[PDB]
Amino acid sequence: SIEDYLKGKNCLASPNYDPDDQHSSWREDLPQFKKDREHLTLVNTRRNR
Amino acid sequence: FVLLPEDAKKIWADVDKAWGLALEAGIPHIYPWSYTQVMRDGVIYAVPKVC
Amino acid sequence: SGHTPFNTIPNEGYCCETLNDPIVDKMIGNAYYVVKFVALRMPFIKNVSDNMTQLLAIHNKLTELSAIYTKLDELQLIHNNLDKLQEL
Amino acid sequence: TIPNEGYCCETLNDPIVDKMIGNAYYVVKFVALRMPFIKNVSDNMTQLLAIHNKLTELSAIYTKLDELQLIHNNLDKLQELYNQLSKLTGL
Amino acid sequence: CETLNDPIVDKMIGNAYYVVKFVALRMPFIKNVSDNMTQLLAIHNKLTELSAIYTKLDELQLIHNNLDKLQEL
Amino acid sequence: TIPNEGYCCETLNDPIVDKMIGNAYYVVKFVALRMPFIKNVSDNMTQL
Amino acid sequence: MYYIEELFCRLANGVLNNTGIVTDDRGDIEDDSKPFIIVAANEALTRLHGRFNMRNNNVVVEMQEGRTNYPLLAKYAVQSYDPNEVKCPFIMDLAGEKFAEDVIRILEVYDDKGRRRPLNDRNNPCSLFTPRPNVLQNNAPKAWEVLNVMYQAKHPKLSTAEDGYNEIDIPDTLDPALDAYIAYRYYTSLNTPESSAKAAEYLSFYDSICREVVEYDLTSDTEVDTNTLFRKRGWR
Amino acid sequence: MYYIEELFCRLANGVLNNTGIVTDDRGDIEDDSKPFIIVAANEALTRLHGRFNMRNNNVVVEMQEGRTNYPLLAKYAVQSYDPNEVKCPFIMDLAGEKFAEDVIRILEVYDDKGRRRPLNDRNNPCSLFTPRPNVLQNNAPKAWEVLNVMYQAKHPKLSTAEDGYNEIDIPDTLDPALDAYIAYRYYTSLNTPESSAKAAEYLSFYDSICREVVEYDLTSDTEVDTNTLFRKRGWR
């Protein structure tokens, strides 16, 4: 993501701000929307179903 | 393409990588090659474990 | 350990600085950027606010001004010749 | 001599207090309470910039509303099938 | 000891607090502007028409009552 | 009045700052950010 | 900093492999036994945060005219108060930080003017008392008076209910202690002679890891400061 | 700060998981076994509050003309007195709470004029005595005389009878001690050797947790104050 750093405005002052989520520097939160692909895996056939 | 089913795992891992690249490119439609090989090798699609 | 945000004026050893940033971080956190965005372009806001009375009056007549604008090309109508003829 | 000064009585519409400017907490909470106004200004900044740019033109118009009020009323009669004006000049 | 360095950019009380105080001392302007978003949006909508009228402001007045009387005359 | 100087506002198209020449980190990062220009010059050296 | 699902899959693929809680694929815990694991995890986090002094947090409390006791509860927080029950709250929060009760011990209390306030001093008239570990007292409230409370904090509550906190914040040297404590609880609950013998091993492992972390001071618990009593006492 | 139902659920999920007390779905304790748990919980809370000195409470006692023994019971409180039996109550509960009978030890007694009154001092004629641990004496009642009593308090009784206290107020570090005490009571009551061994384990766990909390001083039990005898003795 160095390329994104080069071709970016990267200016702190912005007009976007969500009042419902206002926090200090202390708060750290992982997003609820996990991003994950689906891969191909062979069925075990040892774990009988 | 998976002939000689004793070579299923390596070729299917390569298929995973190829599907990843194809998804990155943006192709609309993607096909596994055959019904026979898919049902014979028991290929299923699942999210990887997180550990 | 940690530093209490209200522990401003800790400058016992040396006089300089008061450390007022932590209070801003505590209360106005994540919203300082909007404050700076407004602060940078503040002369424009001052100029617009100074002309509030007038900019409300231009409003109280917007439909009338649009109706007048609909006939701007037709309004001139070369009045000089018809005035000269009417003077006869 | 009942005291009514407190943080509870203050609302978002109250003006600033001169004696409490030195208190950093008071100023910080003063700015924090009135965030809706700053957000409203920030969301519509392009419109304000355009109006500021055209204020020099919109500054004059204001002296001439009174004349335009009568002109607008007259316009309906003033139409007069504008093509007839050329004939009237000819006659 | 002293970390203020350049006085032109760095403030003793604090950069963030300085900006916050600067905004706070000038709140009436922001309040007066914010109370009237609905009104200044209409002017933004009709800005093109207002600019068009501005071009013909110098002309087209002509003491137009004189012209309407001349038509009556 | 309001200061607007920082590493975030800096872009690769901006000119150098004469105040921060003495600061070694500023010079190093100034050269680091503008590496595409140097790479483009080095790739086409025979043509130049 | 990782999700709760990472904890479930680490307990499914570490200890507790041979138990009957885990699913057939041994990749996650069954839906029936998740409340048990959540209770054990909360207990373990409280133990560790009580022992080690990791988190230091802060609260802002403003003083009303007729109140001397100020309990530190969410009922009086701005984001969580009930308007009909409580007329005016006194604990200020933010929409993102809603002040879950995580007060173990109160260390420092500072005035809004930057002056320190003595705590639990009997012979000082201008001091603050705590009748209970989560309650403050100020016997002379005044106008425009606000207090900052610097206190040791515990980990927020894990709930896994789409509104609770999914994440876990813990240094990576103390994951095995948490896992060992959970395993100890689970193996004691079985009530068999062999399970108790395994649980003793797991508890001793937890104790030994905690003692080692104290020994090498990996959390930087020890704190030292410069000497200022040299000037106060009048030395030259 | 949680209700009694949360305690029942936490016991249903933690210790006592294999026992036949718990319902089939492992959600909550069965109805016929709830008084047992309530009695055990009350005993554990009394033990902890006696040990740790968590709660410091105050009561106001007004002095009648012909009475010298003032027992501190709920019969003589304003919010709880029966008009038929007692004509006039001398314990005032006008503002809030109901003054549950929770007097363990009396620490300080102050007059209505701000002057301290000695307790249990034989050689001081103006002293107050306690023939019983909660009864208080003053041998010279006077008109317009009121006394304020600072005492150590215990947790109010839990009843679950639509009028008792549902709330449990205890520091979050000492939940496992309470659960361990309840489990010890149950497993001792079972009257089998294996259950006896498990009960011994749980009691030892209770003691170890209490000693740990004492070591790390999580309840801020230790107190100090500024020296005041330096000036009284005449030093310069």
Instruction: Answer yes or no: do A19 and D42 touch at CB < 8 A.
Output: no
> Which residues, numbered 11 to 40 in chain B, qualify as contacts with chain A under a Cβ-Cβ cut-off of 8 Å?
12, 15-16, 19-20, 23
Q: Cα separation of A44 and F23, whole Å?
A: 61
Structure-token match 């009284």, residue found: H232
DSSP-derived letter for residue H62 is: E
Looking at the complex, does the CB of residue B41 fall below 8 Å from at least one CB of chain A? Answer: yes
Measured distance CA(G235)–CA(F38) in Å, rounded: 63
Nearest to C6 by CA among C35, C31, C28, C26: C26
Tokens representing residue H231 in the block: 């000036």
Q: Which two tokens stand for residue B19?
A: 């599907």
* HSE, side-chain direction, 13 A CA sphere, residue H118: 8
* Cβ pair H198, G96 in contact under 8 A: no
CA distance D25 to D23: 6
Closest C-alpha among G63, G58, G77 to residue G146: G63
Q: How far apart are CA G113 and CA G128, in angstroms?
A: 16
CB atoms within 10 A of CB H14: 21
Q: What is the CA radius of gyration of chain B?
A: 12
What's the rounded Cα separation, in Å, for the pair B3 and G29?
38
d(CA D12, CA D31): 10
DSSP 8-state symbol, D87: H
- Phi, psi (degrees; rounded to nearest 5) at E30: -65, -40
Are H80 and H91 spatial neighbours (Cβ–Cβ below 8 Å)? no
Chain E positions in Cβ-Cβ contact with residue D38 (cut-off 8 Å)? 23, 30, 34
Largest CA distance in chain C: 100
Work out the angle at residue D79's Cα, subtended by the Cα atoms of residues D77 and D84, and round it to the nearest 5 degrees: 115
- The distance of G235 to chain A (nearest Cα, Å) reads 42
H contact chains, 3+ CB pairs < 8 A: G
Residue of C8, C26, C29 lying closest to G114 (CB–CB): C8
Nearest-10 crossing angle of helices F35-43, F24-33:
50
User: Which segments of E3-36 does DSSP mark as H helices, in order?
Assistant: 15-25, 27-34
Q: Specify the residue for token string 């403050």.
A: G136
Q: What is the dihedral of CA A35, A41, A43, A47, to 10 degrees?
A: -60
Q: Which residue of A has its CA nearest to C37?
A: A13
Amino acid identity of residue G224, one-letter, is: V
Dump the DSSP string for F15-47: PPPSGGGS-HHHHHHHHHHTHHHHHHHHHTTTT
Kindly tell me the burial class for residue A8, based on how many C-beta atoms sit within 10 Å of its own C-beta (0-12, 13-18, 19 or more).
exposed
Q: In which element (H, E) is residue D60 found?
A: helix D45-61
The letter for the amino acid at F5 is E
Q: How far apart are CA G193 and CA G162, in angstroms?
A: 39
**Axis-axis angle for helices C32-40, E15-25 (nearest 10):** 60
Considering CB atoms only, which of E6, E10, E22 is closest to F2? E22
- H56 CB-near residues (< 8 Å, 6+ apart): G131, G132, H107, H150, H151, H152, H153
Number of separate helices (H) and strands (E) present in chain E: 5, 0
3-state helix, strand, coil in chain E (%, to 5): 65, 0, 35
What HEC string does chain G produce?
CECHHHHHHHHHCECECCCCCECCCCCCECHHHHHHHHHHHHHHHHHHHHHHCCEEEEEEEECCCCCCEEECCHHHECCCCCCCCCCCCCECCCCCCCCCCCEEEEEEEEECCCCECCECCCCCCCCEECCCCCEEECCCCCCCCEEEEEEEECCCCECCCCCCECCECCCHHHHHHHHHHHHHHHHHCCCCHHHHHHHHHHHHHHHHHHHHHHHHCCCCCCCCCCCCHHHHCCCC
Q: How many other C-beta atoms can be found within 10 angstroms of the C-beta atom of residue D31?
A: 22
Tell me whether residues C48 and D61 touch, CB distance under 8 A: no
Please give the Cα distance from H120 to H131 (Å, whole number).
Answer: 9
- Tell me how many degrees the CA angle H76-H81-H86 measures, rounded to the nearest 5: 70
Q: What is the 3-state secondary structure (H, E, C) of chain C?
A: CCCCCCCCCCCCCCCCCCCCHHHHHHHCCCCHHHHHHHHHCHHHHHHHHHCHHHHHHCHHHHHHHHHHHCCHHHHHCCHHHHHHHHHC
G52: number of CA atoms within 13 Å, CB side? 28
CA distance E6 to H20: 75
Rounded to the nearest angstrom, the minimum Cα separation between H65 and chain G is: 32
In the numeric block, the tokens 């607090």 are attached to E17
Query: Alpha-carbon dihedral of residues G162, G168, G169, G172, nearest 10 degrees?
Result: -160
| DSSP for B1-51, written as a single string | ---SGGGHHHHHHHHHHHHHHHHHHT-S----S-HHHHHHHTEEEEPPP--
CB atoms D28 and E34 under 8 Å:
no
Tokens in use for F11? 């872009």
Q: What are the angstrom distances between the C-alpha of G217 and each of C29, G48, G151, G154, G204? A: 33, 14, 22, 20, 20
Interface membership of G17 toward B (CB under 8 Å): no
Rounded to 5 degrees, what are φ and ψ at G55? -90, 135
**Phi and psi at residue G151, to the nearest 5°:** -135, 155
* CA pair distance G75, F25, nearest whole angstrom: 51
Tokens standing for residue H104: 């363990």
Residues near G161 by beta carbon (within 8 Å), at least 6 away in sequence = none
Q: At what angle do helices C42-50 and C32-40 cross, to 10 degrees?
A: 60
The verdict on a CB contact (< 8 Å) between G169 and A19 is: no
Provide the residue count of chain D: 91
Judge contact between C65 and D69, C-beta under 8 A. Answer: no
C chain contacts of residue D82, beta-carbon cutoff 8 Å: 74, 77
Tokens 């000497």 belong to residue:
G227
- Method in brief: cryo-EM
Q: DSSP E strands: which ranges in H143-235?
A: 146-153
For residue H77, what are its two tokens? 């409180």
Please, are residues D68 and C61 in contact by the beta-carbon 8 Å criterion?
A: yes
Strand order in the sheet with H55-62: H55-62, H146-153, H103-111
Q: Of the candidates G205, H186, C28, which has an alpha carbon nearest to the alpha carbon of residue D24?
A: C28
Our CA-based measurement puts residue F2 at a distance from the nearest CA of chain C, in whole angstroms, of 7
- CA F12 to mean position of chain CA atoms: 6
User: Chain F within 8 Å of E15 (Cβ-Cβ)?
Assistant: yes
Nearest-Cα distance to chain B for G189, in Å, is: 27
* Count of other CB atoms within 10 angstroms of residue D2: 3
In whole angstroms, what is the distance from residue G92 CA to residue G99 CA?
Answer: 9
Could you tell me if E2 lies within 8 Å of chain F, comparing CB atoms?
no
Crossing angle of helices G175-188 and G34-52, rounded to 10°? 130
Distance CA A4, CA G59 (A): 38
Strand G135-137 with G69-71, pairing: antiparallel
Helix (H), strand (E) at residue H88: none
Which residues of G are less than 8 Å from C6 in CB distance? 60, 110-112, 114, 146-148
Mutate to test the interface with C, among D21, D23, D26, D38 (most CBs of C within 10 A): D38
G165 vs G163: CA distance, rounded Å: 7
DSSP H144: T
**Count of residues making up chain C:** 88
Joined together, the tokens standing for residue H66 give: 């012909």
DSSP annotation of H59 reads E
Q: Are G62 and G17 in contact (CB under 8 A)?
A: no
Which H residues, 32 through 71, put their C-beta within 8 Å of a C-beta on chain G?
54-57
Tokens of E27: 């709140």
User: For D72, how many CA atoms within 13 A lie in the half-sphere containing its CB?
Assistant: 16
Residue E29 is which amino acid?
Answer: F
Instruction: Give the residue before each break in chain G, using a C-to-N cut-off of over 2.5 angstroms; say none if it is continuous.
Output: none
Query: Vertex B16, ends B10 and B21: CA angle to 5°?
Result: 130
Residues of chain C found within 8 Å of residue E21, distances taken between Cβ atoms: none
* D23 reaches G (C-beta below 8 A): yes
Distance of CA C49 to the CA centre of its chain: 6
Q: Do H17 and G189 touch (CB under 8 A)?
A: yes
**CA H23 vs CA C60, H3, H36: distances in Å:** 74, 19, 15
